[PDB]
Write a protein that binds this ligand. Sequence first.
Ligand SMILES: CCCCC/C=C/C/C=C/C/C=C/C/C=C/CCCC(=O)OC[C@H](COP(=O)(O)O[C@H]1[C@H](O)[C@H](O)[C@H](OP(=O)(O)O)[C@@H](OP(=O)(O)O)[C@@H]1O)OC(=O)CCCCCCCCCCCCCCCCC
Ligand SMILES: CC[C@H]1O[C@]2(CC[C@@H]1C)C[C@@H]1C[C@@H](C/C=C(\C)C[C@@H](C)/C=C/C=C3\CO[C@@H]4/C(=N\O)C(C)=C[C@@H](C(=O)O1)[C@]34O)O2
Length: 1334
Amino acid sequence: EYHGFDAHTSENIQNLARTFTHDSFNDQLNPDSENFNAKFWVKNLRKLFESDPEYYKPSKLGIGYRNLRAYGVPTVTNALWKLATEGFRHFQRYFDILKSMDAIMRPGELTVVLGRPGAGCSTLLKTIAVNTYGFHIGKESQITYDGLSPHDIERHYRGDVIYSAETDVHFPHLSVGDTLEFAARLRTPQNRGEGIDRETYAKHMASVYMATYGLSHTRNTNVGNDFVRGVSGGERKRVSIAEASLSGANIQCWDNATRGLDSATALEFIRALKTSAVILDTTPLIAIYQCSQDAYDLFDKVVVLYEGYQIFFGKATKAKEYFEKMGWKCPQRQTTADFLTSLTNPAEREPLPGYEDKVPRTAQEFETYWKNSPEYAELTKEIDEYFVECERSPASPYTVSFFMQVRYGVARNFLRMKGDPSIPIFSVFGQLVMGLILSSVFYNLSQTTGSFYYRGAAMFFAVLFNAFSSLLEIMSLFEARPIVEKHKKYALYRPSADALASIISELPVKLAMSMSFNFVFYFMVNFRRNPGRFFFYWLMCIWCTFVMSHLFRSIGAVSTSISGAMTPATVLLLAMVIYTGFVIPTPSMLGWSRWINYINPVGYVFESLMVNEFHGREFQCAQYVPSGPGYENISRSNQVCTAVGSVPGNEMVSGTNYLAGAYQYYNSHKWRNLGITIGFAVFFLAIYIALTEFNKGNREIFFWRDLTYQVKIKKEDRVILDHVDGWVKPGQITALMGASGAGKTTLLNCLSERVTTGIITDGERLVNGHALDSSFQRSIGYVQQQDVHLETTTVREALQFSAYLRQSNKISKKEKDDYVDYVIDLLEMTDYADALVGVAGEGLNVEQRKRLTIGVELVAKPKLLLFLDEPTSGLDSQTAWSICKLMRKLADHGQAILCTIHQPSALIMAEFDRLLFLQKGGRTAYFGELGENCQTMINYFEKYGADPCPKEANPAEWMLQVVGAAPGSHAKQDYFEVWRNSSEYQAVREEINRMEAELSKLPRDNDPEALLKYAAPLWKQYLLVSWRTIVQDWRSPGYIYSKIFLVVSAALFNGFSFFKAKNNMQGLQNQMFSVFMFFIPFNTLVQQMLPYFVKQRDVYEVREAPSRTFSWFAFIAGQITSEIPYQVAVGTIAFFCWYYPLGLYNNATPTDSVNPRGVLMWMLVTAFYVYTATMGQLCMSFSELADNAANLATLLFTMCLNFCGVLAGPDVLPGFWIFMYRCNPFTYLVQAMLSTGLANTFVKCAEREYVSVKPPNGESCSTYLDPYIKFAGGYFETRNDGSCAFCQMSSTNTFLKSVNSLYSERWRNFGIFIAFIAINIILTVIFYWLARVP
Ligand SMILES: CCCCC/C=C/C/C=C/C/C=C/C/C=C/CCCC(=O)OC[C@H](COP(=O)(O)O[C@H]1[C@H](O)[C@H](O)[C@H](OP(=O)(O)O)[C@@H](OP(=O)(O)O)[C@@H]1O)OC(=O)CCCCCCCCCCCCCCCCC
Ligand SMILES: CC[C@H]1O[C@]2(CC[C@@H]1C)C[C@@H]1C[C@@H](C/C=C(\C)C[C@@H](C)/C=C/C=C3\CO[C@@H]4/C(=N\O)C(C)=C[C@@H](C(=O)O1)[C@]34O)O2
């Protein structure tokens, strides 16, 4: 709790000053002397120890204006159309949002803007803080900032005026001390100063400001977010205030900073603002709606708006009186702020007796009265004097140079990495493990020509493993964007400085990754062993990773989520991967494709690495074309190697010749490519910095008796509820009230059987005098506090779903629909019945969402109770009053309601019928009728001895004060003892006994349908959930279109890079790697898909799981079935976009089997596109976060791809890894695909693959080579030289057999893949049961 600038804070500041004066070395300012006052010390410290520069930085600002006037101006099947319309709107009236006003705010005054939502307070505070982005300002207006101008403030005085409204953006894993010290050190001036180190001064600044705002205790504690634990809810707002004050802000504007915050938290926040205004001369503006009287007693000035009209402005204490002079009536026990706010509501409010004709009803009449009043005349006189006085009388807003900003950014980034080493450790160790595994695949490559291909493959993947190694770093960019924006607004540092700091801070991680991967890969794979070759390889890999890191940062500087950046960048990254130079060697490159390789930053890296390895090297020949049983005694001059650069009669193959023939790489480009890659890195770094700088912007009565409830905590059991008894009757509302530690929520959850812990010892809950049965949990509705709804379901659809799945199965659909309509009418939801729920920003209000939740829990027809968990909490005064009226209407119709109420207003409290009050230890203190204006309750606490309640006061707070639960109060008597020793308790016990003895004889109603766990059969639940998920996926905003575009673009690029392809010895390998690259969109698809699984899982587990709507099996089966249709359609599109451009059907013409092979390939592609979804869901079933599931799925996919039989077959793989070659799901898909697409067709060798053979003297190639052609496949062509050209392949079956793919085993492989899909589904279900189902 915060008490302001109390004596304790003064003593703490005294101790801090005493500590600091020793390092540093009027009667005040002496820590060791008497009568020293902390306020004067803090005030003078800023002006004295900060020195005086030659600029005109002001220490206080006040704002005055005279005539301020401000004016202004789905289903995917239609989305594209809408976009087109939007485009037309981009191809090519005048209403005042804020009418004329007059105001003046001076330093040291806390000002509050009041008004109902939509009045225009947010726009006024945006205008004051110079944030007019979305509306214009009238030319007649005149705004003066203590003599400056709005343009002057915006241009080179920013940071003096700040505007933060609702959500605080802090680094969750940075401690409060570090968070404040960062700003303190970034704001201190480096221009000399005093004989004190700057770091010491920043530390003293941070300590003093922590002490001032009561945060000294919360040092070295993570600030945290709504997810990460830390400073709970109110110390974070004070941290934000302290940080804003440290940055020199002099006019701080807040809009509903205390939104969804209880009265105590808002009161302490406003207290912190008041001390900020008092100690440090400041002009804070606050826009609040639910403000307590104690909080309102702190405000210095109030301005009240009526639809942006500013009916009144002036001293807060004189506000009510003025309006009471107007002719309005203020009901007693009503806070002044609520009275002022409701005076603008025609439905509420009422005039004084005899004033029914003099008060105004229109905002225009309100302005007329305001202007005619003498208060407006005095205000105008003051404004004129202020403007006359102001008229009579820094290059950049930042304080430290660019180098200092980037240095501090680097330090903060290191602190963040220390506070969360997850991503760096994961990246480093993933690189290490992947390098180890991949090297195990390529272990100890031979020195003969037979290793050529493998060597190339290695130097390809190494490049890839350096290109994408730094993909995860961009995640940090998505976490620091809001904070960087805020600090730019605060005028602390530029986004460019933060970008450079982020680049510099990740160098250690990049070095660790590069070392851990390369030092193992380059050496366990038998590459060139010379030191110079290794060092050149390492240098090129370093530059490749820098280039790709800068490219990834550039892509992620204009994106908000990993999937959002991944979807459009997937095509680009796949294009760079394909055109590296290995999948499609330059000789095989098509006409339209070469320009892609010319501008590829990775092609040059690959060329340099291959040139470095192969140039100036001789490889021993492995195979000679003429060989076998008939050529066991043939001369070496009549033979020739089978490589590309082979020369007849030579026993060795030159690396230079092979490189110049197969890949067309030359040694002249070894060092030039390094310069090209350096240029690419610099270019991408410049683009990234520019982007991050510029591109930014009933009949049964339920009663409990002797309910005792205890829970074991750390081997110790403490009773949370001690002998709590009561009842709930139809037609009455009972309010469950208590302190924070009174455990009223525990009582509510124990009564409703929604608490999974503890044991009830002496309790007894009964209905109509009978013990509880198995039908209880289905006869009580539970309206949770938080509203968890699907964003893609209309109100009517949600109500219909609940009614269908929760009402009796013997009731026809017509009755269910009619009851849904009746509930919609009763809750006054008919105006927006067919409106998407959407998100909080766009969609339904908080009131509408709460009404929808009550309706959802009402259409189930609960016949016993409606437990409401804090309905009037986190809501405005008027919205809370409306919801209370709705609850009263429900209770009128014949309902029984029990609700827990937290910090209510007097008017709200007067609406309830009965009250159950609990004090520490769950001890009942009162249980009885509230009476009129809570009078009866008061009598109970007044006739037993206590301080009489004031005539004007809130009885809700009076109760807490009386029982000692309020902060700063004395009980003076244990009220449990008097309650147990009262006549009221005896009456309650007698009533409970009478009810138990009487109602137990009533004839109960028996029906087995009510005893079932679920009201609908399993198949119906499965169907309904599957349909809901399908509709949600369809209606998501750009989810199906993103998938379609990604898959279509990737498939088209992969199928047209390999346009109709010659079946030469190299073309077959190119097509095999085309099949291999066809699987790359797996990661992007999983990343896109997982969040929409998270949404449904959250909605189910938070609300639908305990409500017993549908079982876990129905949920998981629906999730599994929802993705099959979309995946099948996308797979069909992908197959049509890839199979035909590749021209594979030509291979089927010779054997006449065109249709079967095309059909089988379509099945295989669709099966892969279903398997990707099944595997993503399997990896997501047991995991908690979407990022972890996506990363695990990517790891498993990479492992499956490594041992899929393309990089190295079973005969090359180590015996240890064969277990992964057989259990792979892709080792069969790839075999089936290759077999279907390539089998049973001829092969024609390219001009560069023909191998020259010189027959022995006196022989022709026919006679000399037919025995070999018979022994092994191939063909030969005569030449006009005496030699002849031999091609080692005559049919594609030879290549397929080499890859270990057979034509007769395609259907078996398809069946095995289907079996793997089934295993994935089964494991998904089982793991979801094991991990998530309680
Ligand atoms: C913030 C970013 C941080 C990034 C990190 C910063 C890194 C900055 C480093 C700067 C250092 C730059 C050094 C470059 C100067 C090279 C001067 C000689 C160039 C040369 O000498 O290169 C041809 C010969 C052999 O190459 P080669 O196979 O082609 O054989 C040739 C023959 O030797 C002969 O000399 C004829 O050459 P020329 O006719 O003159 O062209 C021809 O003869 P033939 O082949 O025709 O028979 C052939 O080219 O290189 C060889 O020995 C081995 C290959 C170079 C060996 C140096 C490797 C240096 C690694 C740098 C450090 C890496 C660590 C990375 C980070 C560390 C910690 C984080
Ligand atoms: C989660 C595991 C590790 O994952 C990354 C970053 C670091 C982690 C520890 C990143 C992966 C590649 C991976 C290391 C390299 C390989 C496994 C080699 C190769 C088989 C993988 C290529 C992957 C891709 C090619 O390019 C695709 C793409 N668009 O085409 C996008 C948007 C992302 C790529 C990707 O996400 O690659 C991609 O899926 O290192």
